[PDB]
């Protein structure tokens, strides 16, 4: 039995174009624990994505937090791509400053 990951992509601080911030990709609710996460700027993998250590919640499902430095702008796009055995293909979720 496999649980499909839930994914939230958001910034640590409210976003202002041109100002340095931190981009988060919080992945939860999945099983098995093996998972592969990439954070992208314009469809290009971002170099230093820090990965928090793995943990699990009271319902046994696993979670983890990937994050990296980024400077939001008007036209650059950001996303988090998650590859997991629960899905037939990698899932890509775009950063939406309104969320």
């Amino acid at each position: 039995i496999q649980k499909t990951p839930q994914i939230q992509v958001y910034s640590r601080h409210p976003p202002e174009n041109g100002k340095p911030n931190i981009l988060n990709c919080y992945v939860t609710q999945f099983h098995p624990p093996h998972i592969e996460i990439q954070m992208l700027k314009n469809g290009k993998k971002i170099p230093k994505v820090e990965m928090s250590d793995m943990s699990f919640s009271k319902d046994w499902s696993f979670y983890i937090l990937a994050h990296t430095e980024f400077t939001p702008t008007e036209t650059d796009t950001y996303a988090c791509r998650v590859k997991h055995d629960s899905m037939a293909e990698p899932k890509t979720v775009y950063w939406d400053r309104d969320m």
Binding site: I1, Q8, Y10, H31, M99
Partner: protein, 275 residues
């Protein structure tokens, strides 16, 4: 109320004998210690500033216990493979959650000891700390075997003694940190949704602890249904974030108000959309 929990995971690796073992300790839901067998030099490490108070003896003892848990999980993983008639190779998971909750009277309120296999309930110790609850047939085998060994007494003694003893110590040691709050910084955003309708999103950021309540009101009434509430998420710096939105008729944004409730707020906030 207060609590302490140790969440442990052992994962079988195809083509390897020793499983990947990870243990994380929590006090009031905040990570304070961690052990990972994949580290260069497997050792329990402090994860909260107030744990730097513990001497080298503490870490030594804890690290030894981890080495023991690794072997227990290793042998147990092997057993379950037979109980379920699973093919060799493949990867499997075994998890455990143990700990205690203290009430307002700071006295013991309850102990916990639960195991899960493949991310699903396997066997758990009942609140009496004497009987076991097996979730399926395979688990009944383990239950029957443990009823004979008085395995429960062992766990009962840890949950009513050691668990209680250290939770009080950690609470005393990390008091200024664990008991603090960071009240939320909130605001309301306005967004287009569709023909004559817009979304009002009420944000709550940088708060701590995680517990919080956000509500929307139209004409003095609560909007439970019609309100979209995201899942609380970490900012990454120790604080949390959450927002709640509602879709509203364009030209009536002012008729809606957001309320924010949090331990760091002696009085709840009241916000409105502000053009």
């Amino acid at each position: 109320p207060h609590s302490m929990r140790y969440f442990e995971t052992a994962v079988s690796r195809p083509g390897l004998e020793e499983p990947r073992y990870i243990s994380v300790g929590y006090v009031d839901n905040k990570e304070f210690v961690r052990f990972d067998s994949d580290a260069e030099n497997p050792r329990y490490e402090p994860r909260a500033p107030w744990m730097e108070q513990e001497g080298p003896e503490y870490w030594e003892r804890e690290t030894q216990k981890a080495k023991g848990q690794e072997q227990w999980f290793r042998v147990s993983l092997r057993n379950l493979l037979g109980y379920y008639n699973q093919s060799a190779g493949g990867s499997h998971t075994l998890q455990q959650m143990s700990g205690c909750d203290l009430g307002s009277d700071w006295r013991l309120l309850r102990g916990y000891l639960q195991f899960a296999y493949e991310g699903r309930d396997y066997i758990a110790l009942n609140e009496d700390l004497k009987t076991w609850t097996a979730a399926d047939m395979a688990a009944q085998i383990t239950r029957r075997k443990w009823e004979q060994s008085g395995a429960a007494e062992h766990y009962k003694a840890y949950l009513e003694g050691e668990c209680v003893e250290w939770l009080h110590r950690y609470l005393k040691n990390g008091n200024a940190t664990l008991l603090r709050t960071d009240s939320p910084k909130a605001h309301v955003t306005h967004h287009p949704r569709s023909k004559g309708e817009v979304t009002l999103r009420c944000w709550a950021l940088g708060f701590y602890p995680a517990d919080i309540t956000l509500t929307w009101q139209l004409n003095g009434e609560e909007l439970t249904q019609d309100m979209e509430l995201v899942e609380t998420r970490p900012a990454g710096d120790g604080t949390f974030q959450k927002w709640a939105s509602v879709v509203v008729p364009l030209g009536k944004e002012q008729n809606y108000t957001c309320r924010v409730y949090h331990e760091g707020l002696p009085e709840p906030l009241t916000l409105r959309w502000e053009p």
